[PDB]
Specification:
2 copies of one chain form a homodimer.
Chain A lengths: L1 E13 L1 H5 L2 E11 L3 E17 L10 E2 L8 H15 L4 E7 L10 H15 L6 H14 L7 H10 L4 E4 L6 E2 L1 H6 E8 L14 H13 L11 H12 L9 H16 L3 E6 L4 E6 L6 H14 L6 E7 L6 E2 L11 E12 L2
Parallel strand pairs in A: 4-5
Antiparallel strand pairs in A: 1-13, 2-3, 2-12, 3-5, 3-6, 6-7, 8-10, 8-11, 9-10, 11-13
PDB class: gene regulation
Keywords: alpha-beta, gene regulation
Assembly: dimeric
Chain lengths: 352, 351
């Protein structure tokens, strides 16, 4: 048999923007639901830019790009940045620093990096492109580097507008309201040390799923709505289909996460719904349940118990609705909500 | 999947005859094997009768028949009793009470009820008909009410003679129960999904009768190989019953068959069985009925195979019973205690 032991429970709350505050800009990271809707959350890439020479750059290679947080193929990331910078047609030489460019899965998120950089430059010098030109440039960079970012248009819109009002659903408007969902649920990204941080997204957006997601969000407003047609329920229905998909072979970790969450959902009223993804599990809990240590431990134990390979850690990130990309100032620095997380250290050992 | 949980294990042993110790008579209930042989067991219908008026009854409706145990279509049962009583040509008015008229399947057993009543009257007034006439009256009642009682003649013989010596096999013919009894515990197993009311669907035959007769006689040899003993033949019959082409078995019979075949292969104590509409007749090694561990395993296997959730499984230990008789303070202890064990279970769908 196997014995699952909790070797640590470490909760944290931090306000990263206060630490880094030349111009500073932020662009929110996103998470997706039913492969067709995107939510900007309270995690963001920050870009600090300082003009070091008031003259025309010899080329985009002249700018100093600081310690880019280490990640897989970070040299490719530099190439992408150099190309984007080239298209911005800068008239000064800059020193640029990037902070927190990794998303919830720990994967580099190119879109918020480029948008934060754009916002930084927009406030640094004149003659910087508008939003429409920005989208054209971003599409060019994505195509040139063959980046695999499903529903890039919705991701870009979510990054520019944020989700304190809407969830960005693929065009058919097509968006749904987030107010009521937020009042009733805690959105949590759960990940084990076995979930990959490097992967090619395998998503299956569709107009059918887009409509379901939109209606679910809009139905959160009616207190009388049957739970089986609310967001958590549709996330779960989508998750069940994802692991039974004919044109998708799910990861072992996705399969095991599905079994664990299905059990948890049926046993705990606080676990309302979820959807497994390649980088982790997006879970909907009753409001404030994220702060219930007993529940968190039970979720971690269930996941560790079902995973066929021994898990050593399970992280839980509480995701609040995030604002749209913007320049950061002393005046607006508190528009950012602290980021809450809890990580459990685990030991799953074969025993007599 | 599903989770099977045992919520209770309740054993009991009772001596019902002592409770009613006018005239009191008893007639044994029976169980059948291979649809062709009948065994009188240690469960019996009891009839208490007292004359309330020393005069010719105005009609059979005059007798007071106390609250008959509640059962399906009990008014029909009353009609049968009234007709039987009419044929007995009684010369006094009686108050009659019936006790334990339901068989192992929970089904009303007309034959023991009528024979116990006859024995009661035989000891109450002069001129009551003899055994030969009784059989004629019973045949008339069974025909008039179109009762569906397979092998009625063998059932009647078993009720009158008991099985402390023989198993009553359809005429061609009986076998001896002596050897079988020393080596096995006969147990009737039933779940809450087995019907208590049903039309018996049995297939008696001379081929099955001969197999049964020889098996009982072969029990005598301690060298005789099991494949030709009673438990083995019961099992062979059961396998064919669920495979029959002129019988569509019940869902509970099919699921019971699967469970018992698995149990029989894994446990040496489970020697043979036969599924029936009202339950499962199982042959266990002598005294194995008192093995709590085995009993629980049998219950769990049945619950695991049943497609619908079972909530209880009962086990009745059946000893060989004596023939119908008047009960007296002198023979009241000739009845062996009735042993039973019931398990409460929960079979729940789970993630």
């Amino acid at each position: 048999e196997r014995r699952v032991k909790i070797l640590g429970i470490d909760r944290s709350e931090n306000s990263p923007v206060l630490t880094y505050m030349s111009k500073l800009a932020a662009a929110p990271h996103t998470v997706h639901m039913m492969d067709s809707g995107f939510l900007a959350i309270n995690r963001q890439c920050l870009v600090k830019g300082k003009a070091i020479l008031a003259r025309e750059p010899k080329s985009s290679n002249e700018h100093m790009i600081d310690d880019l947080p280490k990640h897989a193929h970070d040299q490719h990331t530099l190439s992408i940045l150099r190309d984007f910078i080239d298209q911005l047609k800068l008239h000064n030489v800059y020193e640029i620093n990037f902070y927190d460019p990794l998303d919830s899965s720990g994967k580099l998120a190119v879109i918020p990096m480029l948008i934060a950089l754009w916002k930084c430059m927009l406030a640094s010098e004149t003659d910087i492109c508008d939003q429409e030109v920005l989208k054209s440039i971003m599409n060019s960079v994505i195509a040139k580097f063959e980046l695999q970012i499903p529903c890039k248009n919705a991701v870009i819109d979510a990054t520019l507008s944020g989700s304190r009002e809407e969830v960005h659903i693929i065009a058919e408007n097509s968006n749904g309201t987030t107010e009521h969902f937020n009042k009733k649920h805690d959105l949590v990204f759960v990940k084990t040390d076995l979930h990959p941080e490097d992967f090619t997204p395998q998503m299956f957006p569709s107009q059918a799923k887009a409509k379901l997601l939109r209606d679910a969000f809009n139905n959160e407003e009616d207190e009388d709505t049957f739970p089986d047609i609310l967001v958590p329920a549709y996330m779960t229905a989508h998750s069940k289909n994802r692991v039974r998909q004919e044109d998708y072979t799910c990861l072992e970790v996705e399969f095991d996460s599905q079994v664990a969450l299905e059990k948890l959902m049926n046993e705990h009223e606080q676990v309302e719904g979820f959807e497994v993804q390649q980088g982790g599990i997006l879970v909907a809990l009753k409001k404030d349940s994220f702060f219930d240590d007993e529940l968190i431990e039970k979720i971690a134990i269930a996941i560790a118990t079902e995973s066929r390979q021994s898990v050593s850690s399970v992280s839980f990130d509480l995701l609040k609705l995030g604002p749209g990309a913007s320049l950061v100032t002393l005046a607006n620095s508190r528009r950012f909500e602290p980021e809450c997380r809890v990580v459990l250290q685990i030991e799953v050992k074969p025993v007599s």
